């Protein structure tokens, strides 16, 4: 996408759970299920405010534990998260850390979801003893979405990607160029 983001309304992904949500990149929490997404798909970067992901929605399925590759299932549901925020690239750190030059994490994932554990999502997707897991996710209508978006809380904030159609399409934009 503009930028170079890596932003499909399809793909494989690593998950994760996450704590703390109500003030996310995007510039906007939300009541129902969200999720943070790693930056080469987020379409920005810390600071610069919100990315084409703020807003959308997908449908995750996890089906596969890594750190436990015996493990036969049962998995968690297919759930739908609105991405409204971001998971960064940082150092020492492979969850996340996708790049156009190296665009998958240490599973071979080319997209990571880090679900908020507060509103409930991570309930519904994680089973017991099995928070990190591999699968897929595809982008659907903020329809198939229950919950409410939260009020802006700074000037630029943005979740409008949730009216839009799947990518390929704009709705917040991206920000700059995607991390090398």
């Avoid at 170079?4 to 109500?22: D, E, K, L, R």
Wanted: negative net charge.
């Amino acid at each position: 996408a503009t930028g170079g983001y890596v932003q499909q309304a399809t793909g494989q992904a690593s998950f994760t759970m996450y704590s703390g949500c109500g003030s996310p990149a995007c510039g906007k929490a939300a009541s129902g299920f969200t999720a943070a997404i790693n930056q080469l798909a987020f379409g920005s970067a810390p600071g610069l405010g919100a990315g084409d992901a703020c807003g959308r929605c997908f449908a995750l399925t996890g089906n596969h534990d890594p750190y436990s590759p015996n493990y036969t299932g049962p998995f968690g549901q297919t759930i739908v998260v609105k991405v409204t925020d971001l998971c960064p690239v940082q150092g020492n750190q492979e969850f996340c850390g996708q790049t156009t030059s190296n665009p998958t994490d240490q599973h071979g994932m080319p997209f990571h979801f880090d679900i908020c554990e507060d509103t409930g999502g991570s309930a519904k997707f994680f089973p017991s003893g099995h928070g990190a897991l591999t699968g897929t996710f595809t982008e659907v209508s903020c329809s198939q979405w229950s919950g409410s978006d939260g009020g802006q809380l700074w000037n630029g904030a943005c979740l409008s990607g949730e009216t839009a159609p799947n990518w390929p399409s704009t709705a917040c934009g991206n920000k700059g160029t995607a991390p090398s």
